Amino acid sequence: NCSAPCPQDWIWHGENCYLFSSGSFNWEKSQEKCLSLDAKLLKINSTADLDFIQQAISYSSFPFWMGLSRRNPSYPWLWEDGSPLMPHLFRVRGAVSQTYPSGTCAYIQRGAVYAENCILAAFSICQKKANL
Amino acid sequence: VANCSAPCPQDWIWHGENCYLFSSGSFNWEKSQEKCLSLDAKLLKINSTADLDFIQQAISYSSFPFWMGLSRRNPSYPWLWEDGSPLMPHLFRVRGAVSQTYPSGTCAYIQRGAVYAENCILAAFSICQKKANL
């Protein structure tokens, strides 16, 4: 039967559905919440994804976890699906030389992307494919 | 024609019978009202606690205030939506600038998980709403 591209409360953009979290949680809790909704943490494949996300953030100063992480600085930045961060999308600033017990994760804040201890709390964005 | 359509346009949020647009245009209450009208929509109108719960949840990541369609000329008048209907009781209290009189009236905005009163000529984001294609 015919269905809506995205569920209620989500934002439909292009081929995907986006959900902004209602609160700040650590990266692992944020990951768990996207999985319970048959979604994953935000994955940026192009500058157009980053531009839509920043437009949707609507000038918020808060940090938002995305699905990019690494165990320590010897490992490359990977998305939850194991694929690497494609070059020329964004620079990862901040805590890029330290090793934290629960890993280092990326968040977006005021347009720029920062690396931080995964146990710290931030808002997050979930995404899943739209029904098209 | 006779084909299936999406309940809401892209960049809007579908909730219940309506579509919501959280516009990041920073304009006064009258210009924000005008922009909603140009999109076949009106400024946000909250009819139930479920509407307020959805709105507060949809804007808790935002640090900025959002105009809604509630207003009054001055403190002697009750709060009224764009359609002339009153603020139904047991929904929310309006905090902030509730004793002053501004030349272009007083308008309400939502922020901090709460509704505040402010001078209508001031600039803020706004929430538009229209009926979903159901």
Of B71, B81, B66, B68, the closest CA to residue B112 belongs to B66
Count CB atoms within 10 A of the CB of residue B79. Answer: 17
- Strands (DSSP E) contained in A1-130 are 11-13, 16-20, 40-41, 64-70, 78-79, 92-94, 104-109, 112-117, 123-129
CB contact under 8 A, B58 and A12: no
Rounded to the nearest 10°, the torsion over CA A59, A60, A61, A67 is -110
The CA distance from B2 to B8, in Å, is: 17
Helix (H, G, I), strand (E, B) or coil at B30: helix
Which element (helix H / strand E) includes A60? none
Residue type, A19: L
- CB-based contact A9 B54, cutoff 8 Å: yes
Neighbours of A87 (CB within 10 A): 6
**Rounded to whole angstroms, how far apart are CA atoms B75 and A30?**
44
Count how many Cα atoms sit within 13 Å of the Cα of residue A15 in the half-sphere of its side chain.
6
| Contact yes or no for A11 and B11 at CB 8 A | yes
| Closest CA–CA distance from residue B68 to any residue of chain A (Å) | 17
Distance from the Cα of B119 to chain A's closest Cα (Å) equals 22
What is the experimental resolution, given in Å to one decimal place?
Answer: 2.2
Method in brief: X-ray
Element (H or E) spanning B32, and its range?
helix B29-38
Phi, psi dihedrals of residue B57, rounded to the nearest 5° = -70, -40
Whether chain B has a CB inside 8 Å of the CB on A16: the answer is no
Measure the CA–CA gap between B55 and B20, rounded to whole angstroms.
9
Half-sphere exposure of residue A96: CA atoms within 13 angstroms, side-chain side: 10
Q: Can you tell me which residue has the tokens 């999406």?
A: B6
Do A4 and B19 form a contact (C-beta atoms < 8 A)?
no
- Residues on chain A touching B61 (C-beta within 8 angstroms): 20-22, 57, 60, 62, 64, 123
